[PDB]
Every structure is written in C-alpha cells, then in structure tokens.
Design a protein around this nucleic acid. Structure first.
Ligand SMILES: [Mg+2]
Ligand SMILES: [Mg+2]
Ligand SMILES: [Mg+2]
Ligand SMILES: [Mg+2]
Ligand SMILES: [Mg+2]
Ligand SMILES: [Mg+2]
Ligand SMILES: [Mg+2]
Ligand SMILES: [Mg+2]
Ligand SMILES: [Mg+2]
Ligand SMILES: [Mg+2]
Ligand SMILES: [Mg+2]
Ligand SMILES: [Mg+2]
Ligand SMILES: [Mg+2]
Ligand SMILES: [Mg+2]
Ligand SMILES: [Mg+2]
Ligand SMILES: [Mg+2]
Ligand SMILES: [Mg+2]
Ligand SMILES: [Mg+2]
Ligand SMILES: [Mg+2]
Ligand SMILES: [Mg+2]
Ligand SMILES: [Mg+2]
Ligand SMILES: [Mg+2]
Ligand SMILES: [Mg+2]
Ligand SMILES: [Mg+2]
Ligand SMILES: [Mg+2]
Ligand SMILES: [Mg+2]
Ligand SMILES: [Mg+2]
Ligand SMILES: [Mg+2]
Ligand SMILES: [Mg+2]
Ligand SMILES: [Mg+2]
Ligand SMILES: [Mg+2]
Ligand SMILES: [Mg+2]
Ligand SMILES: [Mg+2]
Ligand SMILES: [Mg+2]
Ligand SMILES: [Mg+2]
Ligand SMILES: [Mg+2]
Ligand SMILES: [Mg+2]
Ligand SMILES: [Mg+2]
Ligand SMILES: [Mg+2]
Ligand SMILES: [Mg+2]
Ligand SMILES: [Mg+2]
Ligand SMILES: [Mg+2]
Ligand SMILES: [Mg+2]
Ligand SMILES: [Mg+2]
Ligand SMILES: [Mg+2]
Ligand SMILES: [Mg+2]
Ligand SMILES: [Mg+2]
Ligand SMILES: [Mg+2]
Ligand SMILES: [Mg+2]
Ligand SMILES: [Mg+2]
Ligand SMILES: [Mg+2]
Ligand SMILES: [Mg+2]
Ligand SMILES: [Mg+2]
Ligand SMILES: [Mg+2]
Ligand SMILES: [Mg+2]
Ligand SMILES: [Mg+2]
Ligand SMILES: [Mg+2]
Ligand SMILES: [Mg+2]
Ligand SMILES: [Mg+2]
Ligand SMILES: [Mg+2]
Ligand SMILES: [Mg+2]
Ligand SMILES: [Mg+2]
Ligand SMILES: [Mg+2]
Ligand SMILES: [Mg+2]
Ligand SMILES: [Mg+2]
Lengths: 44, 92, 273
RNA sequence: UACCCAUGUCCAGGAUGAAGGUAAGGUAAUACUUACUGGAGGUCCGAACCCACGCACGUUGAAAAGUGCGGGGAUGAGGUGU
RNA sequence: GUAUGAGUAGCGAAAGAAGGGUGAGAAUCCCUUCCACCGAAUAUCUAAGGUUUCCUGAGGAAGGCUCGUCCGCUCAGGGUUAGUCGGGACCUAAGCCGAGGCCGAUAGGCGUAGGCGAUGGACAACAGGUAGAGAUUCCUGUACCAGUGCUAAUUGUUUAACCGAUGGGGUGACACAGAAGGAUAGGGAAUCGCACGAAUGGAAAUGUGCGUCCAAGCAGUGAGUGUGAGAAGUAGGCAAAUCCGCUUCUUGCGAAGCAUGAGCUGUGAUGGGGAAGCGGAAGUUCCUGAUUUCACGCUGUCAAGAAAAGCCUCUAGGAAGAGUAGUACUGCCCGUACCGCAAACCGACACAGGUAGAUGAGGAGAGAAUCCUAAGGUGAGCGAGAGAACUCUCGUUAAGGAACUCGGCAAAAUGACCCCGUAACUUCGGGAGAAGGGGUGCUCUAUUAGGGUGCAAGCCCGAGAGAGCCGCAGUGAAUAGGCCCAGGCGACUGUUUAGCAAAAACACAGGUCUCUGCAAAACCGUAAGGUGACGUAUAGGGGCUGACGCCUGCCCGGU
C-alpha cells in the first residue's frame, strides 16, 4: 500500500532544521556532539 | 558594487549571438545585483540608452572528474535591450 | 410544543424534537457575535483531560448581559431567538439609547414588552433588582453571588429559585436543587422562571444526533483490560469483583461524597439538598 | 498509525414518497375522507470513491500482506488534501 | 576468496508483419504500409515530490534480466526572460514565539502587550507567432493598474481649496438539502466552399471526403435578483461626529429610482487563424443542451453555520497649495528547464502496489454503467517451434440431479423496460422488486393521435391499435436480484484485532444509582496555568444495563 516516508520540504526543516535545534537546550547539545565527530552536515 | 563589479563578462553562444541584430545583449552579472542596478551599470560603461533588462538564475551542475563530485558556480544572466535611437555594443 | 416523528425509518422511530414556535427571527445581531473554537476536552498542554468531547457542529458565541447594570433606561424586547451555546433562548433588547444587548429569555416574555432594572423597577417578569428589595416568596432566576459580578446561580432552561426570608445582611434563597442558601442582600436577581421548560422532554433517537452536539462514545469499564480500569479483566462477563464500584482512577464512585470537608462557604448553607 | 484542531474539497444516474399546503366533500365548529402539490430520511438500487466476507492462485512471490472472480457502504456516526 | 546444486529456476500481466536505410555486426535502431490495444483513459493540464533526468554533437568499457549502431547510461557544449501568473514587500485561523510578569533545587514551565504563521480573504492582460531546447515571461497587435516630471487652462490661501485616521460605523461575512428558470460551453443536422466523381454487379448525383472562425479592453444593452422614502429629536457607539443605532410624524407600494447581474451587439478585425492545391475559398439556419455561470439567488430545516485586511463613510486632526486635460517616463525580490496514475514521486529494482485537483467526445443508453470508436496516445526490453504427462486460467458435455461433502465450498441458475398480481405477521411505516405470471424483432397504415420549438419555413419528441414477414431463439452481443419455510443471538445504521478471528464482541438512542451551589465536582501539572465552560442542577463527572412491550420477588447478619 502506502509507505512510512512521505517527503515534504517544509516538514523536514521545521522538525530537523538548524533553527529548530538552536531553539532548545538539548537541541544545541545535538549540534555540539555532531561537531565533535566532525560530521560534514549538521541538522537538515 | 561599482559598475564594473556588477557586470562580469558577456555570454557568447549560438543563442546569445542570434539576437545581437535584435539589439539584445547577454551578460553575466553579480549574483546579488538587482534588475535596476544592471540598467545603470550598462549606461555608465557603454553610454547606451537601455530599454529593458530581463534576469534569470541558474543552478550549478553536478560534475564528476573521477571519484570526486562537486558543483559548478551558480550564474545570474541578464539580457539587455536598448532603444532604437541609441548606439550599439560591439561584442566583436 | 414537542414535535413527534412518524416511524418512517428505524433511526427516526423514537425521535422527538421542539417545534421552535417561540422563536421570532433566525438571524443573530452581527455586532454581538464572537468566534468559538472547539477544545475537545484538550488541556493547556494538549492532553485529553475530560473524556467524551469533540467534533460537533461549529457555533459562534453570543455576548449575553448577565450583570444588567443599565438602570433607569427602558428596554423593549425586540426578538426571541436561538442560542446554540445554552439550553435557554435569548432575547434582544433595544434600549432607549439606541444600543442592543442580549439577555436570557424568561418564561412569559414576548415581543413588544418593556423591561426595567434598578431600585425603582416594578416586580414584573423580566425586571432586575437587588435582593434587598424583592418581596419574600417571589420566584427569581439569574442570581449572582458577588455584587457587581453578574448573574450566575439559576440559568438553565426551566429552572427557578425562591426567596424564603431575610437575615439582615443576608437573604435566604431556596436554589433549584432544593438547597437553602444565604446570599448577600446587595446581589441582584431577575424575576421569573427561565422559559424553555420543554427542553427536558427531547428524545435524541439517533446515535448520530449525539455526535452533532459534540459527544463521543463512552466505553464501560467492564469491557477493558486490567491495566486500563479497575473493573477490567476476567474470562467471559464478570461482575464487579470489588468492595465498591470505582472510577477509572480509583476513588469509589457510588455514594462516596467528594465535597471538601473544610470548605469556607460551609457556614452560608442552611440545609443541604 | 490512533484521537483531536483550523481551513479547503468529492460523492454518474435512478426509485420511494414524511411533515406541511390547496380544492371538493363533512360538521354548529372541529375530527375525518378523497385528489393535486410538497420533497423528509444515520431511506432503497447502483458507478467513481472507501472497505475487506468467500474461493482460487501466489508462498527462494510481480508484491516483507498482493492479484483474479464474486462481496459490503456509497448524503453520512461519510471519504479525502494542506 | 572460491566451489556444489547447474548451464538448472527465472528473464516481472499485453499482437505483431513485411519492405527499404544505417552499420564491422540488426527480431531489438530509423523510415513506410498494413494490423492490433486504451479512449471518465493507457488522452490534455496542473500541485507535491525529485533536482538537470530537458536539447544538440560524439560513444558503446560498465548499467539495460537477451541484443543494441539505441537509451532516463558515458563525455563535451548548451537551455529556464514577468508592473498584470503563484509567493514576498498586504491580511488573518489552528498553532508557535513571547519585553515586562507569575511560578519553580538548577535547568526551566506558563503567559500580557507585540509578532510570526495558508490549507482561506484582497489584488491591474488578452489573442496570435515562434522547425534544437522558454512563453498570460520573448516578438506583433490592442489594453489596464499605481506613480512621476513637463506644457495649457481652472481654483483657493488661514473666518480658511483640499486631505483624512493606527479611532467610531457599514460592508467584507460565510451551514446543509431541494426545485424551478435565464444564459452559455459542448454536441448534431441542413446550407455554403473546396476536392474527387471511382477498382468488382450499380450510381454524374437524394454520390463520397474535409472544412463550415476569433479574444481582453472600450461604448451600449440586458434575463433576473435585493429593494422603503423623507423630515424632526438624541441618557448609546472610551473624546467628537452631519456617520451608525433608537424614537416620533408626512407619505406608500410587482409602479419607478437605487445596488448588483450571467449574457448579447458594435469596435477591437485593412488584424489573425483556416481544407486543399507557398498562397489560401466558405463561415449561414435550425435542433438539442449542461456536472459551468446568474447563485447559497429562492424555498425549507435544525445540528444554528471563521478572523483580519481591503472598500465606503464620520469626525478628531493637517492645511497653501490643489485637482483637470494632454504628453513622455518609472514599476523590486523568489519560481519558471523536464517527469508528474509514472522507467524521473513513496516502495532496496526500468517493481502487476500507493499518489490531491481541473477538463474528460460520438452511437445505442437513465447514466461518468456496458460494447465499439473520435482527438490523442501505445504494441509493454528475451525470442521460435513442438502441440507429451502434470499444474493454472477458460469452453462444452450423453442418462441421473447433492447420491459429493464437516458443510450445496466452488460452479450452475435469476438479472433490463412495460403490464397483471401478491400471504402469515406488524411498532400500521412495513413485509414487497414477497411469491407467481404475460409482452419485447422488422415492414406498411405513418413527415400518427398528440406534444416541444419558430412569425412562418422547417426541426426534434413517439404511446396505443390494426394488418402482415422472418428465425431454434427478437432486452437475439456486453452489462443488470435466485426464491421460500422455521429456530438461536444481537433491536436497528455504525466500530473492531495494519499482517490468522467482522462475530453472539464494542458503540448506540433509552433506563437507573450516585457525586457536584460554582475558585462546582472530576482530570493534567511541583506550582503557576488550564480543560470542565466563555457552561450553572432541564447543567457537568462516574458505575451498571442496552430499542420497544409486560415486569424486575425475598435477605441489611458479613463487607
Ligand atoms: Mg509535527
Ligand atoms: Mg541530517
Ligand atoms: Mg523572473
Ligand atoms: Mg461522560
Ligand atoms: Mg456505554
Ligand atoms: Mg476484552
Ligand atoms: Mg488495577
Ligand atoms: Mg473484575
Ligand atoms: Mg464466567
Ligand atoms: Mg474518579
Ligand atoms: Mg440525516
Ligand atoms: Mg443510505
Ligand atoms: Mg484515493
Ligand atoms: Mg479497518
Ligand atoms: Mg461495488
Ligand atoms: Mg474486488
Ligand atoms: Mg445489497
Ligand atoms: Mg535438477
Ligand atoms: Mg526441468
Ligand atoms: Mg517483459
Ligand atoms: Mg518543485
Ligand atoms: Mg533525451
Ligand atoms: Mg547487455
Ligand atoms: Mg559505428
Ligand atoms: Mg546515441
Ligand atoms: Mg545524458
Ligand atoms: Mg508586456
Ligand atoms: Mg500574489
Ligand atoms: Mg523574560
Ligand atoms: Mg510561552
Ligand atoms: Mg494576539
Ligand atoms: Mg505573514
Ligand atoms: Mg493560498
Ligand atoms: Mg490579479
Ligand atoms: Mg517543452
Ligand atoms: Mg457572520
Ligand atoms: Mg451552440
Ligand atoms: Mg453623541
Ligand atoms: Mg466584445
Ligand atoms: Mg439562506
Ligand atoms: Mg513547462
Ligand atoms: Mg521493462
Ligand atoms: Mg510502477
Ligand atoms: Mg469534474
Ligand atoms: Mg462515453
Ligand atoms: Mg444518446
Ligand atoms: Mg457525461
Ligand atoms: Mg477497443
Ligand atoms: Mg451432463
Ligand atoms: Mg441433458
Ligand atoms: Mg434436495
Ligand atoms: Mg458419504
Ligand atoms: Mg449426504
Ligand atoms: Mg456459494
Ligand atoms: Mg418474504
Ligand atoms: Mg418458425
Ligand atoms: Mg448488530
Ligand atoms: Mg487481521
Ligand atoms: Mg478476515
Ligand atoms: Mg488551579
Ligand atoms: Mg476556563
Ligand atoms: Mg451488556
Ligand atoms: Mg433484584
Ligand atoms: Mg450493612
Ligand atoms: Mg446494620
């Protein structure tokens, strides 16, 4: 039938975007730990 | 920017040169230049009278050269048409 | 009266409804309307705190005058019309100033009457006075508890109270539930009974007519699981295998009194219901 | 996916004929009877749409739940987009 | 890393054939003819999503379930043009953030002013052309919206032209169902124009084929739909108001006047498009007719059907400049390529699955059903040849007709329109399409009896009867209820274990018990803050029973 992933440009940025991570204390911890690994892309 | 900073270089192709006789000139402009700045930049450099400007944005093409993937520069292309009672620009 | 439907369909077999013979107009006053949005029993935090709510016809709020502060200015009953937000009907009043306000329609109120409020008002159905100057034995409604707040105690359709006596600073009132209560003598009240007394006799008749009013289905606790309700579990049908029937949160539900035992307002209640 | 909120949108055709109204009759006046009108309903038959009752086949599948022939609802406690 | 199974299973719904061409090499690439498939789609647009997959020139290592000279693959160059389209510089809903502020071991939670936020509101452009790739964007023609400067006249200067709110008021502004109309799109016949005029018995005309037009804007008109007029006075609209609201008098009515209003006519048109043989003739009359528009307009019902901006108006205020006409100039940012029921989106795949919306023709037909076709699009990325067992999907069967089997499971049978006729029981509505029967084709009466349309010409709709004619068979194909008797359960419509159980289970309208006097009880949270409820005992929460009919007995020692 229909599958679990239904793409949407707006829905992706509003949940996983950079400004969403920067608005919470625990979202800034995700960016801090992703910078520690030196990951190419932070957030979505 | 300056007049020489807004405008970078002309575009010389089959489509670009097929409209030179129509008094339409194709340029590559700065990515952050508005349609009005391009109008006054042309009149400062070539001293022609400008009638219209049409702009469009181009993305970068994904290119490969062996195990390496990247993109070319994104472009901003402007087409300038001049009034009939004005001089011409010699791409030559 | 009460309209009755022929048994044309199984869902129309037992329905009864009002005929709205007392409703004068079908358009509300545009300047006294406010939007309402359904909460569906959802909390400040988006949680479902009250069950069996949500999903009916959409409505709009009518600004209704409960304080009735406009003293000395006559007001004519212009229309009697329908309010979806309450059981009783409402009436539009054109005051002599040119300004319009909504009140609850009392029993025996019809278009063309004149309604007063204040100390000099007469004891007629629809007028509003302070309790200090209303004769003993009259039937009133829209009683308020704090002076200047607005009508609060008797407000449903067909309900009414009665004045029993005076105790100086206070006035005895027998509320609609049969409770005798002391009310401050400076508070206000409106004369008469609320006028839609046929509202009790409506037979809904359909499962889906309850859904138009915003009432989602209710599930008995005996057909749940042991982790859902104290009554859940058991092979086959099971009785209430406990000392007393209990609410979904513990706290026995049959006969158990839940009024606070050290409540301040307990000295103003002469006798309980 | 479950429930809810705000704002949009979809449901080919056909059938039946509730309340009410009008005319003739009928009465002291009403009940009531007959014709025409009217267009109600979690009404009926049935496509799109939603669903999943039977069987067969697939079962290192076309498919980590499907297809084929029949089947239920189809103006509502309806389906569906953002 | 490499074997065995093994050159074995598979190669993913479907109709292809031949003749030319290219090439080292052709079932598979290109062209031509014939044939076949879809056609309320397998056709045309357009959102989301994907990001160059679009075009041209080269290429055949790998990918393509075979082949390849080919490709959505590789390489190199190109391609997306907006004052008017969609979004921002305009507005707000749900929701989110939130100066001060209220709570809280920290972290933080909540929340006022204020602000973001479309899936909605407001808002000025149409018709053609474009042979590699863009078109309300480029070009041609004709427009509109806002603003600016300049020329010529007009007017006014503080008893003050004119402007006018970030404030008041009106509008914007709204549900569902039903019916009857006006118009138009679409469709169909004659007329007219052009071409042919014929292969095999016949036809030079009651012959055949194709076509039988056109915007926005501007001027006029217009089916209709709403439709009380004037005067006087102001306890109200945070101040004021000549505006709104309220009161009182004169005057009354399918008659006008005011708002809207689909459409029609002239101009736009000395323009554009147009079948044939590069130029281009003709464009009339009638019938039918919407699921589109007038228009939530009218009627009815109860479950009682967003906000703000915008527009108009009123003053508060600002005021020496202001309108008018003509001309010329000015108008920003983002998207625009291509696929888009699909080989380019979500499913690991070039995957028999899923994917919102607008249009969606003809014959027969009530119909978007069914069969065959139009415009348009396709022949499905392995083949040919033999016609064994066995498996799957179909078609017929002599005599019998459930004897099969756990069980008539599966299959077979009924099926459309018109007429006759129809039981027990009943909550009087039903049961009921009960059951059971009869008639359907073609020709002549006959451009019917009669209707719709029109001034007439004419054009559509078509029941009864008679006479006949032909088959085994006349809704001659596809599509279209099998029925009856009796009992258990559940009153009914509805819901349920995505992926083993659709039910006698849940729900339901109704009944009863019990709590709750409002800072209500109950519930979430440490609290603040909330739902309950912008409600008030005819209201709200909890337990049990489950339409309707007749009823619901005894025990208070134990808990
Ligand atoms: Mg979310
Ligand atoms: Mg990421
Ligand atoms: Mg652009
Ligand atoms: Mg409840
Ligand atoms: Mg229940
Ligand atoms: Mg259970
Ligand atoms: Mg327990
Ligand atoms: Mg138990
Ligand atoms: Mg048991
Ligand atoms: Mg409880
Ligand atoms: Mg209904
Ligand atoms: Mg139904
Ligand atoms: Mg769907
Ligand atoms: Mg289900
Ligand atoms: Mg079906
Ligand atoms: Mg099926
Ligand atoms: Mg059925
Ligand atoms: Mg073997
Ligand atoms: Mg073998
Ligand atoms: Mg294949
Ligand atoms: Mg996109
Ligand atoms: Mg290509
Ligand atoms: Mg290959
Ligand atoms: Mg070669
Ligand atoms: Mg090639
Ligand atoms: Mg390529
Ligand atoms: Mg233009
Ligand atoms: Mg816009
Ligand atoms: Mg703060
Ligand atoms: Mg907050
Ligand atoms: Mg706000
Ligand atoms: Mg915004
Ligand atoms: Mg929008
Ligand atoms: Mg516009
Ligand atoms: Mg194209
Ligand atoms: Mg409104
Ligand atoms: Mg026509
Ligand atoms: Mg005033
Ligand atoms: Mg015109
Ligand atoms: Mg209405
Ligand atoms: Mg395009
Ligand atoms: Mg393939
Ligand atoms: Mg596919
Ligand atoms: Mg449609
Ligand atoms: Mg058709
Ligand atoms: Mg037809
Ligand atoms: Mg149709
Ligand atoms: Mg066919
Ligand atoms: Mg046989
Ligand atoms: Mg036989
Ligand atoms: Mg038998
Ligand atoms: Mg046997
Ligand atoms: Mg047997
Ligand atoms: Mg069977
Ligand atoms: Mg029967
Ligand atoms: Mg015979
Ligand atoms: Mg049942
Ligand atoms: Mg299951
Ligand atoms: Mg099942
Ligand atoms: Mg509290
Ligand atoms: Mg509250
Ligand atoms: Mg039970
Ligand atoms: Mg008992
Ligand atoms: Mg005891
Ligand atoms: Mg005792």
């Amino acid at each position: 039938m229909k599958r679990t992933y239904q793409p949407s440009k707006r829905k992706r940025k509003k949940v996983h975007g950079f400004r969403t991570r920067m608005s919470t204390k625990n979202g800034r911890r995700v960016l801090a730990s992703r910078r520690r690994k030196g990951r190419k892309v932070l957030s979505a | 920017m300056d007049a020489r900073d807004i405008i970078k270089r002309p575009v010389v192709t089959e489509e670009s040169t097929s409209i030179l006789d129509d008094k339409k000139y194709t340029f590559e402009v700065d990515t952050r230049a508005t349609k009005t700045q391009v109008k006054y930049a042309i009149e400062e450099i070539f001293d022609v009278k400008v009638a219209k400007v049409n702009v469009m944005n181009y993305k970068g093409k994904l290119k490969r050269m062996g195990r390496y993937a990247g993109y070319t520069n994104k472009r901003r292309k402007a087409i300038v048409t001049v009034t009939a009672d004005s001089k011409e620009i010699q791409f030559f | 009266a009460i309209k009755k439907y022929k048994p044309t369909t199984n869902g129309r077999r037992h329905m009864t409804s009002s005929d709205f013979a007392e409703i004068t107009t079908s358009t509300p006053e545009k300047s006294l309307l406010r939007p309402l949005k359904k909460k569906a029993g959802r909390n400040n935090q988006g949680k479902l705190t009250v069950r069996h709510h949500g999903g009916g016809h959409k409505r709009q709020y009518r600004v209704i005058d409960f304080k009735r502060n406009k003293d000395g200015i006559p007001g004519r009953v212009a229309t009697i019309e329908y309010d979806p937000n309450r059981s009783a009907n409402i009436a539009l009043i054109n005051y002599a100033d040119g300004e319009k306000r909504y009140i609850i329609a009392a029993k025996g109120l019809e278009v063309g009457q004149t309604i007063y409020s204040g100390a000099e008002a007469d004891i007629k159905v629809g007028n509003a006075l302070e309790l200090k100057d209303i004769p003993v034995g009259t039937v009133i409604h829209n009683i308020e508890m704090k002076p200047g707040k607005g009508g609060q105690l008797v407000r449903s359709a067909g309900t009414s109270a009665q004045v029993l006596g005076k105790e100086g600073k206070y006035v005895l009132i027998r509320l609609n539930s049969g409770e005798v209560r002391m009310i401050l003598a400076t508070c206000r009240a409106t004369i008469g009974q609320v006028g839609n007394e046929q509202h009790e006799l409506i037979n809904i008749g359909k499962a889906g007519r309850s859904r138009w009013m915003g009432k989602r289905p209710t599930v008995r606790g005996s057909v749940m699981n042991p982790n859902d309700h104290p009554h859940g579990g058991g092979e086959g049908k099971a009785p209430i295998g406990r000392k007393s029937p209990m609410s979904p949160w513990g706290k026995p539900t049959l006969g158990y009194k839940t009024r606070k035992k050290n409540n301040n307002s307990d000295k103003f209640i002469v006798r309980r219901r």
